[PDB]
Amino acid sequence: HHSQDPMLSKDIIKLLNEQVNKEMNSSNLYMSMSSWCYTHSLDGAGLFLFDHAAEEYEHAKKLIIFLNENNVPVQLTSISAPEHKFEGLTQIFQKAYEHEQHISESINNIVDHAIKSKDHATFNFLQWYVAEQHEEEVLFKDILDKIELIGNENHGLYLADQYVKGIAKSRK
Amino acid sequence: HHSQDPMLSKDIIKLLNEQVNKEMNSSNLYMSMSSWCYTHSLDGAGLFLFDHAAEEYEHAKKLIIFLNENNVPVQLTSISAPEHKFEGLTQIFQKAYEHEQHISESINNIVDHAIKSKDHATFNFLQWYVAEQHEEEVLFKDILDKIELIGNENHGLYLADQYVKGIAKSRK
Amino acid sequence: HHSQDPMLSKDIIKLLNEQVNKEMNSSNLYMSMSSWCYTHSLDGAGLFLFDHAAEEYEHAKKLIIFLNENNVPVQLTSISAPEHKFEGLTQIFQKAYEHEQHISESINNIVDHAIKSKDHATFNFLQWYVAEQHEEEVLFKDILDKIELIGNENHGLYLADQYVKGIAKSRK
């Protein structure tokens, strides 16, 4: 039997499939960061990063659904093992914020290509993703700001972890 | 500051981490099978396999939570690129059933090791997973039996896909 | 058409099929004991033993369901005619308690074999059955204890039968 061709252009297909893989890679990075926190008495950050990891995978799934509905083959590549070597809470959140900036840039690039290609189905679809990623990037900026404001001296780590725990609980 | 040592034995830690990675690999395999179905006019099987993929990832997350609570570092490996080329619906479900048999065996091995090691915290924890995996294995056996009973001749693929669609919707 | 092979090992299949037949045999034994009581003015014990007979058959049915779901042929043998010759209420409950001990032993043997064979699907499945059989064995111990405490002298049988009637009614 004959099935209809992919409804999206080759360039958009490539960008979206790359994004699915990016989100899967991201989810594993956050699981690794989460585990570091949990094994270093930082269960507030552990919980926050675990729930964030789960959310990034939810994004991957929503992108997959869009590919499926457009008859676009989902092309899953090898998901690289995440980094696991971390120096401390501040470094983890510094890395995480930089990572979120990279994710934001990647989404901006897809949306820009959708505009250039006149693919307004894809442009319109990605709007929830633009909005949610913006919220996540801001969130990581705010947490990093707070960790750096508190510091790590006299009970600093405890204060920071409890702050992050509060955020984790308020979001679930 | 000093954090407490992992609460599980070395062998159990390794088997559980390997299981997390098995479930992640499984989830990506099912996403790939799902995509094949969606791109070959089999949206019933597509939906079923997508939802199943998401469920295997849920299992991975529950395993991660247990590792976290026991102060056990989670070691995520590189998740292999799943098979993407398939012959048809029957082959996909034949492969899936064999895969579920492998997953069941892997869990049996962990539970057996927990008994031998006298790790009854882990034995007790794994019981939901034993039960859910058994249900999933039986489910794939049943779907494969039904696909083989219907066959591929005449409107066979349509009938089989609609049957699988019904299961997918009922499990939501 | 091809149907999938039994999902359980040959040894486990044999043990479970034997257990189905054991429960059917047990249900008929209890019906016989019940009838003896009803025809000797002991309607309290009659009701109790009838309802117990029905419960043992419910166990047989649940075991059958498990065999069915695993694609295991149910092999029903001849169900031997139950003993019908009884001396009195005490003897009936002495025999019944010994019988329940035998049933408990038989279940212990299946669970032990499941562990040895690493069949944790079956181990996990049998847990409701282990728990319920334990309750039933304890119940028969308690009733036998009470019958022996009361005795059969001045209104003893009436007192014992009314005691058992109370239990029967409280359980339904």
Next chain:
Amino acid sequence: HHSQDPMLSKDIIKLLNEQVNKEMNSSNLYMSMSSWCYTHSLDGAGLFLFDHAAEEYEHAKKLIIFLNENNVPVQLTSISAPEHKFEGLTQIFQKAYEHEQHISESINNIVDHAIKSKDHATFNFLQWYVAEQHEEEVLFKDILDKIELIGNENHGLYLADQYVKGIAKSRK
């Protein structure tokens, strides 16, 4: 102590006891037919025949209750091992319908004997059983008619099994 004599005549006692044993035999036959269906990818028929088997045992229990209330000893015989080898769905339902015809005849015989003996307590008691058996006999006639109308060619078995599955679910 003295217990009152059986309240029913010798002939009626024998026919009723024989009927209890007939229903027990019937229940085991249907369990065997059900198992054949479940192991040959016919889970619709499997479910239907399992539930029917359980219902025949319910009839046996109601007959036993009546014997008990009339101070009539229940005489349980050895329940024969049921047929376990079958040719297919059509043969199973052909055999089942013939079996239901036999059961209907057996009940007709008891009711007739009750009239001849002027045992109107028994005649009156049996009316629910006459009514329920008639419904069951008609049901098996209808299912057999449908299996024969569909046939075994093409997707015939699948269609027939799904039809029977629908009936099974609607009767729950």
Next chain:
Amino acid sequence: HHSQDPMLSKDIIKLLNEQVNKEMNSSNLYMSMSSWCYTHSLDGAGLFLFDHAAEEYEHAKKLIIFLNENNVPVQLTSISAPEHKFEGLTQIFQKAYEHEQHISESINNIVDHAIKSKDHATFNFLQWYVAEQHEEEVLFKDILDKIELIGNENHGLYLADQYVKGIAKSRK
């Protein structure tokens, strides 16, 4: 009058009776630790440890109930006078965590012996206890981790005690 023999084996009887006494030793230890905290301005830890002591006694009672139902004599030994002198909050929780590890090991040993003896009534019964003990052991690990993360330096004791107070209140 004759009462039925104990329903458990001599070895299991010994292990379970030892466990009852272990829980009653534990309960008294925690009451003593709790008192130390209350008399040294640590009412958060005082409350937590008092409530924990009460819970260990609840476990002892549940074990006693199981012994009673199996006609097993409860053999209460002398309960040793608990340690009453302590160095501080960190030492108390270090000692408590080590103690909970010992309790976990003791339960693992009973469960292992139940498996070896084929006593699946006892195995099944102990599962709530395995699960609850695991939660308690994890809890003490978590509290010790937090006490160590905070430290005893300027306001440290206050912060740690308030943290423990929050846990105590949330578990009520």
Next chain:
Amino acid sequence: HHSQDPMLSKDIIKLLNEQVNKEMNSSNLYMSMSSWCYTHSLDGAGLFLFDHAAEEYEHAKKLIIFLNENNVPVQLTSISAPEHKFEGLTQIFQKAYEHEQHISESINNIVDHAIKSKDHATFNFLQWYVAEQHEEEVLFKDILDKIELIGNENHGLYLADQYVKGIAKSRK
């Protein structure tokens, strides 16, 4: 840091700590009596005495709470092993009633000393305990009276145990 001195006098501290240990001893005695009843077919008395044992420990805990709130160190001594051998139901309740009389005397002594010392905080606190102990003493007098009224002959033990069972259940 400085913690405030105990708020009670040395004599009152001694009497209250002695009372905590008395109640713990009492609870273990009643657990032993309960077990005797349970292993000699007297589950009515078994349940009653088990629940009473638990209640005596509840008293111990309430006393401990009062010591804690007054910054008074709790001084737990060795709890000696309870008597495990008994002659029968009457003997157990005779011993129990005498024991309750002793407990009542001990409380009277503390209250008297509180009045003499002008410790009206303690006098006021103990009023629930005076009232509850009075009810318990009266209860054991009533049960002993009933056991003696019934006797040990001709179903006497059964009648007495059932009477006590009724009280146990009504107090739950």
